[PDB]
Design a binder for this molecule. Structure first.
Ligand SMILES: Nc1ncnc2c1ncn2[C@@H]1O[C@H](COP(=O)(O)OP(=O)(O)O)[C@@H](O)[C@H]1O
Ligand SMILES: Nc1ncnc2c1ncn2[C@@H]1O[C@H](COP(=O)(O)OP(=O)(O)O)[C@@H](O)[C@H]1O
Ligand SMILES: [Mg+2]
Ligand SMILES: [Mg+2]
Lengths: 287, 285
């Protein structure tokens, strides 16, 4: 049952929490950039005979290179298995072609990762279609219980999804909190703009928890937050699994919301909700 | 045929397209707000032999190549052929220590999974060709370097290391000149040690040729030792001129002129390899 938890640069915080829970020490590569900007890494730890769990996100160019080179480096050891855990899975928003001649980015990248591993897992992937681009079992873990635990003793009247894709998540979270829920219809206009239709639910004087998978520009949370505030909401909590927080996102959100709490899949000052338990449960099931 | 020009290779790709009597294709390209890469090919690639021209050494170059390999799947093409004038990660072609990646191996496996052929110019070590599932050709800049220097007054062609000896033996012979090589030991990313053979270069004009200039450490050290030995003039050439910060200065302190190819575009790209690449393409279609 020997396991090694590899912590890539993007995921030191979550990887450390996972390793601690599992009573093991995180393995980090010796790593640097050559002068020409190529990536170097090395695993001095003897990975022979162990189930290997590589923890790293896959959205930035550097994250991808670190994952790919890690997948080569560990071939130097006769490992028992190689299991990719990408807490935030990059390119999950480009899961099909929207115009002729576009890449299906999550397809080619998933095919690559699955060619070099025995399993892949992520937390709350943007669209499940991508899971079906993998030749190995690609598991979609869920932050639901961690979010419930954070809000167990927080006063909330409704849990709200900003889109129809998030209906199941919020039905589950509200169920577990003994609260009501509804979802908003969303249409994305461009990288930074969305349009919404909010159902005729009376939220006057009500405390709301909005939950989504990703916060990038904050356009989605900002729009839902603003429209709900217009409707008289008294307090709005915002949570998302993956907090990227680019392009003045924090300000856009807090213009109409009160607090932001995301998980540690992407490490930021808002990472108050750890998904370590969910990832450990998965690891124990494999190891 | 369709010639696709990735961002790293616009100049060489244009010269290639011109020679092959076609107009180059460039993707619409942008970064999403979260830094993810977007690209799109609007030109109908259906039924054509596709030649993707782009280097493969920086993170973005690799991502542009991988995403292009997905994007062109939207068209029913006749063939897909990668031409990476400078092939990234060719210096990590084996494991020097336990637990290192064979970077050139996994990347080559990836590229050869989505193409019918790969080519590069003067790969750093030929072992990497064997990592490919498909025909992987190694093109050569030798004749283009010879053409450039054919009427230049040179006494010796010099290789800074054992690896570049075959190249300089070929270039010198073609130029009717003598040659020798220096033995080199790399100390770290920026430092090498060399032993120059007992060759009389006092008042001699020298052409140093290597495959890659990165930091310029290798050229600087060789140039300096040869200058100490009385060399009167030193030309520096390389196939792939990366010239990372400081390299230009380090080299010009001991050398008189730098001339590299257009595999990597810079102000020193005076020697083009478009002919060699076009010759290769014509064999493919
Ligand atoms: N990382 C990204 N950031 C923003 N938009 C992206 C990203 N990747 C792909 N897209 C684009 O998002 C659009 C699809 O979004 P859509 O499914 O309409 O809304 P949602 O954002 O709810 O998934 C497509 O035009 C696609 O190219
Ligand atoms: N892009 C790169 N830049 C610098 N050094 C690299 C690069 N890729 C690999 N290396 C390292 O170069 C070393 C091998 O160099 P070596 O073959 O001894 O000398 P050289 O290649 O400079 O003639 C190995 O330690 C390898 O890790
Ligand atoms: Mg979508
Ligand atoms: Mg070498």
């Amino acid at each position: 049952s020997g396991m090694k938890i590899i912590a890539l640069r993007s995921s030191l915080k979550l990887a450390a929490r996972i390793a601690e829970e599992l009573k093991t020490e995180p393995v980090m590569p010796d790593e640097r950039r050559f002068p020409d900007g190529e990536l170097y890494l090395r695993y001095d730890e003897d990975l022979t005979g162990h189930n290997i769990f590589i923890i790293g996100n896959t959205h930035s160019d550097a994250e991808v290179m670190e994952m790919i080179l890690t997948l080569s480096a560990i071939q130097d050891y006769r490992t028992k298995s190689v299991n990719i855990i990408a807490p935030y899975y990059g390119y999950a928003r480009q899961h099909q072609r929207y115009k002729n001649g576009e890449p299906i980015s999550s397809q080619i990248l998933t095919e690559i990762y699955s060619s070099y591993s025995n399993s892949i897992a992520t937390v709350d992937i943007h669209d499940e279609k991508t899971l079906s681009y993998s030749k190995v079992k690609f598991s979609d873990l869920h932050a639901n219980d961690a979010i419930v635990r954070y809000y167990k003793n927080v006063d909330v009247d409704y849990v709200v999804s900003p889109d129809d894709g998030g209906l199941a998540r919020v039905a589950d979270i509200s169920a577990k909190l003994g609260k009501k829920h509804f979802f908003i219809e969303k249409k994305r206009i461009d990288d930074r703009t969305v349009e919404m239709k909010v159902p005729n639910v009376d939220v006057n004087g009500k405390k709301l928890l909005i939950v989504d998978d990703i916060i990038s520009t904050g356009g989605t949370i900002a729009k839902s937050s603003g429209l709900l505030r217009e409707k008289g909401a008294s307090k709005i909590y915002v949570s998302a699994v993956h907090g990227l927080f680019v392009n003045g996102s924090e300000n856009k959100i807090l213009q109409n919301a009160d607090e932001i709490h995301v998980t540690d899949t992407v490490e930021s000052k808002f990472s108050d909700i750890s998904v370590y338990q969910e990832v450990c449960n998965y690891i124990r099931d494999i190891d």
